[PDB]
Subunit: 137 residues, 3 copies
C-alpha cells in the first residue's frame, strides 16, 4: 500500500548484551529514531518488508576493546547476505560497516546477527537503518 517506508535505530548505551541476546546473537537497538510504516520490530530489532520492492540497508556496529574480533552479517530470513568485520585494540573504537540493496517480498525479515566474537563492553553508537527505494509489481 504505502510507498513511504523507512526505519532508523541506534544503540545509545554501553550496557552489556542481554541473556536472550546471548542466545540469538541478534544485535539490539534500544533507540528508534525513524519507523515510518511501523515495519521495524524494535522488540526484536527486525525489519519486515510490507510489500515487494527494492530495499536499502546500512549498518555500522561499533565496539570497544574486549579481547575479541567480530563478524557482523545482515540476515535475510536466516541467511547472510552481506558481512562486515572489526579488529580489536585498546586505542580507539572501531566499526564493522556495510550496506546493500536487496529485493524483499512481503513478509521477508531483515536483521543483524553477530556471527563471530561478542559485544562485551557494549556496542554504543551502533546504527542500523533502511528504506524502500521503490516497490515492484
Amino acid at each position: 500500500g504505502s510507498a513511504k517506508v523507512a526505519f532508523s535505530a541506534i544503540r545509545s548505551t554501553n550496557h552489556e548484551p542481554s541473556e536472550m541476546s546471548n542466545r540469538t546473537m541478534i544485535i539490539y537497538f534500544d533507540q528508534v529514531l525513524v519507523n515510518i510504516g511501523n515495519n521495524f520490530d524494535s522488540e526484536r530489532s527486525t525489519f519486515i518488508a510490507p510489500r515487494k520492492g527494492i530495499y536499502s540497508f546500512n549498518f555500522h556496529v561499533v565496539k570497544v576493546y574486549n579481547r575479541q574480533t567480530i563478524q557482523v552479517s545482515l540476515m535475510l530470513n536466516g541467511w547472510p547476505v552481506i558481512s562486515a568485520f572489526a579488529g580489536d585494540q585498546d586505542v580507539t573504537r572501531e566499526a564493522a560497516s556495510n550496506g546493500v540493496l536487496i529485493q524483499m517480498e512481503k513478509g521477508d525479515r531483515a536483521y543483524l546477527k553477530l556471527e563471530r566474537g561478542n559485544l562485551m563492553g557494549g556496542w554504543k553508537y551502533s546504527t542500523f537503518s533502511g528504506f524502500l527505494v521503490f516497490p515492484l509489481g
Copy 2:
C-alpha cells in the same frame, strides 16, 4: 515544494584547518558535487531542510597520522545524533564513517562536528552527502 532534494560535498585538499574551523569544530568541504534545491550552505557546510520529511545522511571523514584519535558526529541543531571514530597510525589513511535516516522539520540544520581530536595534516578524500527520501504531510 520540490520533492527532489540532494547534496554531496568532498574535501579535495590536504590543506590545514582554518582559524574559524579551529573555533567551531565544524568540518568544511570545499568541493560541492551536488546541491539540488540549494539547501546546502557550502560556506558553512550545513544542510537546512526545506520541508518536513525523512532525510538520509552519510559521511566518511578521512585523516592521516597526527598523534591524535578523533570522534566525528552528525549534529542536528547542535545535538549529536550519530558518531564515528578513527584511530591513529602512520601505516595508512583511515576513516570515521557512519550514516542514518532522520526526520527533519523545515529549518532544521545538519552538519558534521569534530567532537574529539583534530584534523591537522588535512582531511582529504572526506565525504558528506544526503538526500530527501520522502516528504511528510
Copy 3:
C-alpha cells in the same frame, strides 16, 4: 524512461584476481543481487546511467593480509570522484568504504578501480551498489 533504477553486486569468493583484472585494475563482482533496468554490466562490473539524474553509490571493499595497503576509487568515465583506504595486518579483515551522490548523464560509466596495492588473497564480502535517487529534465 523508467524511473526505477538500482543495482547491487557482491564478491562471494576468496578466488584470486583474473589476468584481465590485473590489467584494468577494475574490481569484479561475480554475484549480482539486484539489477533493475539492466544498466549494470556484470561482465565489466560497470554501471551505465540510462538517463540524466542524481545517482547514489556505495562500496565496501574487503581484503585480507597480503603485505599490501590499498586505495580504491569510484571512477566516473575514467576519473576518480571519491576514494577509500585500508591498511594491512593479519589480525582481521578490513574494508575500504565510501559513498557519494553524483549527477550522471545518459551513457556515463561508473565503476571501482584499485588505484594502489593489490587484492591478492581475494576480496570476498566486498560490495558495490547504487540507485537512481531522481531524474533531471
